[PDB]
Design an enzyme around this catalytic site. Sequence first.
Site, PDB file in Angstrom:
ATOM      1  N   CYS A 191       0.829  -1.197   0.000  1.00  0.00           N
ATOM      2  CA  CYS A 191       0.000   0.000   0.000  1.00  0.00           C
ATOM      3  C   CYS A 191       0.866   1.250   0.000  1.00  0.00           C
ATOM      4  CB  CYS A 191      -0.937   0.026   1.207  1.00  0.00           C
ATOM      5  SG  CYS A 191      -2.017   1.431   1.089  1.00  0.00           S
TER       6      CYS A 191
ATOM      7  N   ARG B  18      -0.326   4.434   2.822  1.00  0.00           N
ATOM      8  CA  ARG B  18      -0.358   4.176   4.257  1.00  0.00           C
ATOM      9  C   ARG B  18      -0.069   5.393   5.124  1.00  0.00           C
ATOM     10  NH1 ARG B  18       3.484  -0.727   4.866  1.00  0.00           N
ATOM     11  NH2 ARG B  18       4.228   0.071   2.848  1.00  0.00           N
TER      12      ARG B  18
HETATM   13  C1  HEM Z   1      -6.240   6.258   1.674  1.00  0.00           C
HETATM   14  C2  HEM Z   1      -6.104   6.109   0.355  1.00  0.00           C
HETATM   15  C3  HEM Z   1      -5.427   4.844  -0.212  1.00  0.00           C
HETATM   16  C4  HEM Z   1      -4.666   4.841  -1.309  1.00  0.00           C
HETATM   17  C5  HEM Z   1      -4.293   6.068  -2.171  1.00  0.00           C
HETATM   18  C6  HEM Z   1      -4.210   3.484  -1.526  1.00  0.00           C
HETATM   19  C7  HEM Z   1      -3.395   3.086  -2.567  1.00  0.00           C
HETATM   20  C8  HEM Z   1      -3.108   1.774  -2.855  1.00  0.00           C
HETATM   21  C9  HEM Z   1      -2.617   1.230  -4.107  1.00  0.00           C
HETATM   22  C10 HEM Z   1      -2.294   2.039  -5.387  1.00  0.00           C
HETATM   23  C11 HEM Z   1      -2.465  -0.092  -3.944  1.00  0.00           C
HETATM   24  C12 HEM Z   1      -1.979  -1.069  -5.030  1.00  0.00           C
HETATM   25  C13 HEM Z   1      -3.176  -1.948  -5.382  1.00  0.00           C
HETATM   26  C14 HEM Z   1      -3.267  -2.126  -6.871  1.00  0.00           C
HETATM   27  O1  HEM Z   1      -2.289  -1.751  -7.554  1.00  0.00           O
HETATM   28  O2  HEM Z   1      -4.306  -2.640  -7.362  1.00  0.00           O
HETATM   29  C15 HEM Z   1      -2.885  -0.443  -2.592  1.00  0.00           C
HETATM   30  C16 HEM Z   1      -2.892  -1.698  -2.020  1.00  0.00           C
HETATM   31  C17 HEM Z   1      -3.371  -2.077  -0.778  1.00  0.00           C
HETATM   32  N1  HEM Z   1      -3.998  -1.247   0.133  1.00  0.00           N
HETATM   33 FE1  HEM Z   1      -3.963   0.773  -0.027  1.00  0.00          FE
HETATM   34  N2  HEM Z   1      -4.755   2.666  -0.525  1.00  0.00           N
HETATM   35  C18 HEM Z   1      -5.523   3.480   0.299  1.00  0.00           C
HETATM   36  C19 HEM Z   1      -6.244   3.056   1.407  1.00  0.00           C
HETATM   37  C20 HEM Z   1      -6.166   1.813   1.998  1.00  0.00           C
HETATM   38  C21 HEM Z   1      -6.917   1.375   3.157  1.00  0.00           C
HETATM   39  C22 HEM Z   1      -7.920   2.310   3.875  1.00  0.00           C
HETATM   40  C23 HEM Z   1      -6.577   0.098   3.422  1.00  0.00           C
HETATM   41  C24 HEM Z   1      -7.024  -0.878   4.532  1.00  0.00           C
HETATM   42  C25 HEM Z   1      -7.717  -0.512   5.611  1.00  0.00           C
HETATM   43  C26 HEM Z   1      -5.591  -0.309   2.433  1.00  0.00           C
HETATM   44  C27 HEM Z   1      -4.978  -1.541   2.353  1.00  0.00           C
HETATM   45  C28 HEM Z   1      -4.330  -2.008   1.241  1.00  0.00           C
HETATM   46  C29 HEM Z   1      -3.886  -3.361   1.012  1.00  0.00           C
HETATM   47  C30 HEM Z   1      -4.067  -4.496   2.050  1.00  0.00           C
HETATM   48  C31 HEM Z   1      -3.306  -3.408  -0.207  1.00  0.00           C
HETATM   49  C32 HEM Z   1      -2.641  -4.606  -0.927  1.00  0.00           C
HETATM   50  C33 HEM Z   1      -3.482  -5.878  -0.935  1.00  0.00           C
HETATM   51  C34 HEM Z   1      -2.803  -6.839  -1.883  1.00  0.00           C
HETATM   52  O3  HEM Z   1      -1.907  -7.624  -1.446  1.00  0.00           O
HETATM   53  O4  HEM Z   1      -3.172  -6.803  -3.088  1.00  0.00           O
HETATM   54  N3  HEM Z   1      -5.369   0.755   1.583  1.00  0.00           N
HETATM   55  N4  HEM Z   1      -3.258   0.728  -1.971  1.00  0.00           N
END
Ligand code: HEM
Lengths: 412, 412
Positions: B109, B112
Amino acid sequence: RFLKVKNWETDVVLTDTLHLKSTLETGCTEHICMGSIMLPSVATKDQLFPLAKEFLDQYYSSIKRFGSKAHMDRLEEVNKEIESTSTYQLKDTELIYGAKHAWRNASRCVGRIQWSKLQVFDARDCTTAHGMFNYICNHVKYATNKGNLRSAITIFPQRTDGKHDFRVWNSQLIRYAGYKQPDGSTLGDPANVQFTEICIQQGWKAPRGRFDVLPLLLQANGNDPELFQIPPELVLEVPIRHPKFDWFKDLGLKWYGLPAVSNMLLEIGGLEFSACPFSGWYMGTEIGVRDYCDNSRYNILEEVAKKMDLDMRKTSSLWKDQALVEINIAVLYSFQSDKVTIVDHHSATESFIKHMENEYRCRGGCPADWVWIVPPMSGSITPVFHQEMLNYRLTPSFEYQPDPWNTHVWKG
Amino acid sequence: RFLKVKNWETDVVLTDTLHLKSTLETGCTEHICMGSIMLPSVATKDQLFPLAKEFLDQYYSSIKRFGSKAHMDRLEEVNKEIESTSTYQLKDTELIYGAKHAWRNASRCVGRIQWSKLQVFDARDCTTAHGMFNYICNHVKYATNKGNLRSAITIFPQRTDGKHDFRVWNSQLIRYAGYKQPDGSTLGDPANVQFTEICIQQGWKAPRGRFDVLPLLLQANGNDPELFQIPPELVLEVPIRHPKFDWFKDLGLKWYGLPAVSNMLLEIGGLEFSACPFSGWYMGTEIGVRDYCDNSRYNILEEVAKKMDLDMRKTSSLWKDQALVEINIAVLYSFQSDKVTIVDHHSATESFIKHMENEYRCRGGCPADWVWIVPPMSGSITPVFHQEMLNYRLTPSFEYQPDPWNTHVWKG
Ligand code: HEM
Ligand code: HEM
Ligand SMILES: Cc1cc(N)nc2cc(-c3ccc(CN)cc3O)c(F)cc12
Ligand SMILES: Cc1cc(N)nc2cc(-c3ccc(CN)cc3O)c(F)cc12
Ligand SMILES: C[C@H](O)[C@H](O)[C@H]1CNc2nc(N)[nH]c(=O)c2N1
Ligand SMILES: C[C@H](O)[C@H](O)[C@H]1CNc2nc(N)[nH]c(=O)c2N1
Ligand SMILES: [Zn+2]
């Protein structure tokens, strides 16, 4: 024991058993992955024969003569010389094979589809810096081929004791100089500012401009290194123009045609060749993305945005991306319009998937470093972004080695 | 034991000791790196107390009350309930902490920096699919906030036996449908073609068009799942226009505002929450690069090149890159002009370096997956391309879990 790598854009699956032959460590453990660390990390007669044996075993198992008569006699021959001299010498054929396979095993190389078309220059009879200069000039001439570039490597004598090492102090045979200014900022290539000052320290007369081709600093048999200037007729340069934006010539950029890395160590059957410059041709992004647009390199995204009529106030206008594509269209066009070999990152990464398919079939795998294979622009619109890759260290191999000025016991 | 990660654009060095707390395996070994593998890989009362203990030990060591009176009594309290029920229940405060830290530890992520501003919705009193629908509707409403998006997660009852699992069958609460055609090709989102057909199989009436918001398939207490249609007033959509190319509206594209992944498993102190949809806001490239331009997704680079007057004959004209930047300028502009929260990949990756600096100081490290952090376009002009990153698995964590239709013992 028979690991699977998937492509997620094509759903194609390959099975890797080549990694079983792997020997060296990666830096990763079961509880930490170090695949994004840039550089993770004198020999004796004991460790040398397993390394010779292992190498000779795969060399003869590759000319369809594994374990045969000539293999067992060469095995004994090398054992005898490692008893006698506590080292050994490679046959010309073994040197060509080893070099070609060090490239074949370079997991960070997207250009490996060409690995077998490698011209090996045996410079193991070299003794002086002047000899090295001469060998390097013939390498540059040959590999440049008036713009129809050809892959080549030149192999200077192997390490013996460790205090009599052959080294090319340049990181690449052809690099532009970098000069710091009174106001701190940098003219030329900031990457080479330290090396450019070492050349001045050794007597180089800097034409303190932009694209000044550095001199060679060649160290022979552990002696202090000496400066030589490549004849500029051998240094082929491409001036960068755009096929639309005629103000692009006003930018006044250019790059050399020949990427020829000289600071790495070639390892073949336990033998260490501390000076082994190898050259191919450029993938466009190396120049237009990294050389031209890294913050700590030529850093031209400022001007290219300007002359394009770009929204530079906001970060989210993507003016940086938009200028970045134009720069790479220009480098490609400029190289192709001069019949200078260059490959774009779409053709190069498709070629690599194709190469990856060949290795998994006739070899059982292809060690590959995703962090380095995916190009530094437009990652996901290239087929390698979606290709799972297993990284592992096979030998023969090219290894990183420290800069000589940190390690060389001077005297003069 | 005290590993160093370097940035090579800024020369900044941080020291990682957080990886010492790491527990789970990565898939890499000393002799193979699997950092580019996409998915590398019922509990008992024995393993459960170390997991509770470890979690409670870090929870109380985080409210400045480690090993204190209330910690030792909670330790005993949980031990007693794990003897009694062979499971246990988290306090509301422990659930919020765990959820926030599962996000904090999500090494893939880039967003974060916001991990502490996470709204936790406790839906552990849920029992039926309708209840899940209701909870999900309040999640979507809340997290959307009329375009001023807010981070949130909704946590349905934890796994117990394994046959009474709460699952959201959708991979995301809001996804467009994909429909295969007579001529094989795909209308809508090709990623969801299988799920779109499962919804038809369960009685969904498909408006077989492009951007059809899928229904929810909610499984409660291991019962067979049931379809519910999110009220379209709760599904906020941004129509994509360019701030130059007025033919961009003619493209007739749009995307939902709310990325809300629903198919993953939340792990907190050994407890497994099989249904825990979490939402943030989009980084632009997720839509404009991956959703719109992956070959196996909307695959629009064809048309966008056309209407731009582009050289599509040669691969080396970089028409693919050039159209790719325009698409992402448009998505960003369209979201911002509607006051819908979105972040560009320059601002998002700078924020992450800044976040990385905070974690190494007040926490000793930040598990990070370079392969996933570097954006899928313009990799090297973002600060994360040059940032060495250590990946390792901390807990609490979000884990991948199989699709329910491969595992769920049906009956109805
Ligand atoms: C606040 C704005 C957020 C942004 C801008 C963001 C951005 C991203 C991006 C670009 C990815 C890559 C996923 C992909 O390429 O399809 C990602 C993955 C991920 N995000 Fe964040 N995210 C946000 C919020 C969150 C929240 C609120 C959570 C959990 C409570 C979270 C948990 C995760 C997890 C667990 C993954 C990876 C899961 C996997 O292994 O595929 N994210 N995020
Ligand atoms: C034939 C055309 C070639 C192309 C298009 C090509 C392309 C590339 C590129 C783009 C990289 C990444 C380096 C960077 O990003 O700075 C690379 C790395 C590398 N190449 Fe190739 N290359 C070619 C020829 C060769 C040859 C002839 C050799 C050796 C005989 C070689 C050995 C290597 C090695 C050892 C590395 C990685 C070294 C390291 O760890 O940094 N390449 N190549
Ligand atoms: C042979 C060859 C061809 C090419 N077209 N490009 C290369 C690029 C490199 C390289 C440069 C710098 C660094 C460190 N910044 C690592 C490298 O691998 C190399 F060794 C060989 C190359
Ligand atoms: C929370 C959040 C915000 C955001 N802006 N984007 C996300 C993207 C993903 C994701 C999607 C698909 C896949 C698999 N193709 C892996 C992911 O991590 C996710 F889970 C959560 C996200
Ligand atoms: C930190 C990171 O490992 C470093 O910037 C790497 C990333 N990938 C790369 N990939 C290539 N081809 N060349 C590079 O210099 C780098 N640099
Ligand atoms: C093969 C490779 O691991 C796979 O395509 C990954 C690469 N990096 C990624 N990075 C992000 N952010 N999202 C992704 O889907 C992927 N896909
Ligand atoms: Zn690894």
